Amino acid sequence: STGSATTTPIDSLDDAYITPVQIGTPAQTLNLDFDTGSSDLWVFSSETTASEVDGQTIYTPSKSTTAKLLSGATWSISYGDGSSSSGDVYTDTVSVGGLTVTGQAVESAKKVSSSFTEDSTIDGLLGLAFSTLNTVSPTQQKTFFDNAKASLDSPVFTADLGYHAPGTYNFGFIDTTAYTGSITYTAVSTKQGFWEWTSTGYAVGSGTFKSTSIDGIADTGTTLLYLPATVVSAYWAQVSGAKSSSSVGGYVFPCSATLPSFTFGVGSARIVIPGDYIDFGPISTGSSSCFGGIQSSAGIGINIFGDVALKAAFVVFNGATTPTLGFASK
Numbered sequence: 001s002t003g004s005a006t007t008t009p010i011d012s013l014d015d016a017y018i019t020p021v022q023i024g025t026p027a028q029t030l031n032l033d034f035d036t037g038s039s040d041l042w043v044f045s046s047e048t049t050a051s052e053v054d055g056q057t058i059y060t061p062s063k064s065t066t067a068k069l070l071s072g073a074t075w076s077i078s079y080g081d082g083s084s085s086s087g088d089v090y091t092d093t094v095s096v097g098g099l100t101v102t103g104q105a106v107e108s109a110k111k112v113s114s115s116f117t118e119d120s121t122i123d124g125l126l127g128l129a130f131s132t133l134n135t136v137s138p139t140q141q142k143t144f145f146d147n148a149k150a151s152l153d154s155p156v157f158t159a160d161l162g163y164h165a166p167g168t169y170n171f172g173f174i175d176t177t178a179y180t181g182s183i184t185y186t187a188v189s190t191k192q193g194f195w196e197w198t199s200t201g202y203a204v205g206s207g208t209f210k211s212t213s214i215d216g217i218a219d220t221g222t223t224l225l226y227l228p229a230t231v232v233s234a235y236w237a238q239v240s241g242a243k244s245s246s247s248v249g250g251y252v253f254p255c256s257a258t259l260p261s262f263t264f265g266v267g268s269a270r271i272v273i274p275g276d277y278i279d280f281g282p283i284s285t286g287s288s289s290c291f292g293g294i295q296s297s298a299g300i301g302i303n304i305f306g307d308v309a310l311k312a313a314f315v316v317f318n319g320a321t322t323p324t325l326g327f328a329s330k
């Protein structure tokens with residue numbers, strides 16, 4: 001089997017991407033944030049505290065004839081930015097772009113933190129990291145990908161995120177029309193439960209390539225590119241007036257600037273992030289200070305190849321018994 005679904009930026013800055021997902025019988029369609037940095041499929045639901053729902057589409061398990069309470073199971077998750085959610089668990093039928101999983105754990109939110117409430121366009125998250133990170137207790141549950149894997153033509157999914165435009169998540173096949181040149185594959189470590197790999201280095205603009213190992217994770221659920229302070233300082237040093245602001249919480253730059261590209265290494269291959277991809281606009285409405293799309297990972301504990309990096313590539317998440325990651329230009 002295979003599946004193919006379009007993913008769409010939630011706003012004009014590509015702060016996140018939502019993908020339609022069918023849950024239950026008859027189908028209830030929710031727009032989920034596909035997140036290769038976590039492993040929980042959770043949704044706003046009829047069980048979510050009323051004051052914490054503001055515009056989201058909710059899942060109502062009582063209206064699904066295939067919904068079954070997973071008796072005794074609870075879940076509780078906190079993400080890298082301090083946001084969180086928790087609740088109980090149903091199993092139900094879940095379909096993504098024509099690909100159907102029966103008995104998928106659908107984690108029903110009883111509580112969500114403010115940043116989720118304030119995000120009316122995101123109805124939930126669909127985790128695509130390794131199932132070892134799934135927070136369901138006392139019986140850990142499998143991701144949508146993990147459950148579909150054996151049925152897929154090939155044990156892979158691909159992320160093809162658009163810049164200020166829709167993109168595609170495919171399951172079970174590699175669309176050879178979706179990229180240019182060849183796909184370069186690189187080793188993955190699952191030891192932290194992430195799609196963790198090692199970049200071979202970087203370049204700023206038309207500058208020379210610096211060979212240096214940068215361990216990081218491919219995370220569709222993170223907006224920006226977070227890299228070591230050395231690398232990030234080298235980038236912003238090429239933008240006149242750019243500076244790190246503690247009050248704003250990262251590098252900002254004059255909105256009148258033209259940003260340089262940023263290149264990262266994948267083995268001997270190179271992925272080029274155009275400068276415009278690194279512009280996240282005025283820090284506040286009407287401001288002439290703009291927020292940068294490349295930031296320091298120093299306060300995180302891990303480097304994160306988020307959407308800013310990933311949207312510049314066609315990315316293969318290969319879930320064979322020895323997982324690997326593939327990157328192609330497009």
Ligand SMILES: Cc1ccc2c(n1)N(C)[C@H](CO)CCNC2
Binds near residue numbers: 081116122
């Ligand atoms: C993957 C994920 C986790 C938590 C959150 C999230 N995404 N949202 C939608 C955005 C992402 O920039 C930030 C707000 N914190 C909640």
